[PDB]
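A brief tutorial aside. Many learners find it easier to grasp structure tokens once they have seen a single protein encoded end to end. The record that follows does exactly this for Cyclin-dependent kinase 2. Read the sequence first, then the structure, and try to relate runs of similar tokens to stretches of the chain.
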Amino acid sequence: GPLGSMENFQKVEKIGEGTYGVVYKARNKLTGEVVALKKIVPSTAIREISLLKELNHPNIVKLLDVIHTNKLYLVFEFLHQDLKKFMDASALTGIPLPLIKSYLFQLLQGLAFCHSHRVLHRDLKPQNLLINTEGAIKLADFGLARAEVVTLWYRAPEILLGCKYYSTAVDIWSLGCIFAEMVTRRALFPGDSEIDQLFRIFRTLGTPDEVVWPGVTSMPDYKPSFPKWARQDFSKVVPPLDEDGRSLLSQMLHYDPNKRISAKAALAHPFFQDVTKPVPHLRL
Ligand SMILES: CNC(=O)c1ccc(-c2ccc(F)c(C(=O)Nc3c[nH]nc3C(=O)N[C@H]3CC[C@@H](N)CC3)c2F)cc1
């Protein structure tokens, strides 16, 4: 790419770096706006990101600009905290349920929007769910169809079993995993290898078979030698979540992508009958 087109940005600080790339806080030297800068060119990707520029929703971190100068910079609306840090800060008391429920409701709204345009996130985790002082939560760093050890903790089972053409249901799984983690203050399935991840899922939800998941035994990475564990009861998995919450979570964690609840159906679940939008206690 050419030169000088990032001149208009002053790096304020490195936020972090990982498999995604590098993320900075920066100020536009001419408009004064404070933004997040992601540093990473294919055309398969250039038109994929351009689609995301048009994918605007109050629960999606706005993509402001895309700048190619051996580097691709994406410019994002800046947010002051992520859900992981807020979870850790909240660990002694827990996030109050009404806040958990608001955050879950909002992310399902954002996902419902993305999914209605057939856009998948693919890599939801607490670290890319961004929050502000007003009680909003937003989806960040959408994963591309092509594209510091990647975590598997939120990866859906069909991905782990070798599905090549997976669906929006993978985001519902990831979010159910995050929901459970907000409630219990412990990761649900903290696998440290692909098989440890699969087997942690199997040990809680039961080893899947053709009864609960038609087609599972023909999946590319399925092996008949998989151990057969019995399912645990949910009341043991996420206490003290109430029965509405457990019901919704059970549907977000169905093995069969065709049974897993959609984002739109989840919004209608009775768990949200009393949803509100509380203010978080954020110390910045
Ligand atoms: C262990 N780490 C991870 O797994 C992980 C870590 C970062 C990412 C990631 C990758 C590419 C991105 F474009 C974005 C992104 O869009 N970021 C933002 C957009 N607007 N504001 C921000 C922002 O980062 N704000 C900070 C949040 C809390 C800080 N305390 C202070 C400000 C992103 F967040 C993905 C995974």
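Self-check: The radius of gyration is 20 Å. If you spotted this yourself, you are ready for the next section.
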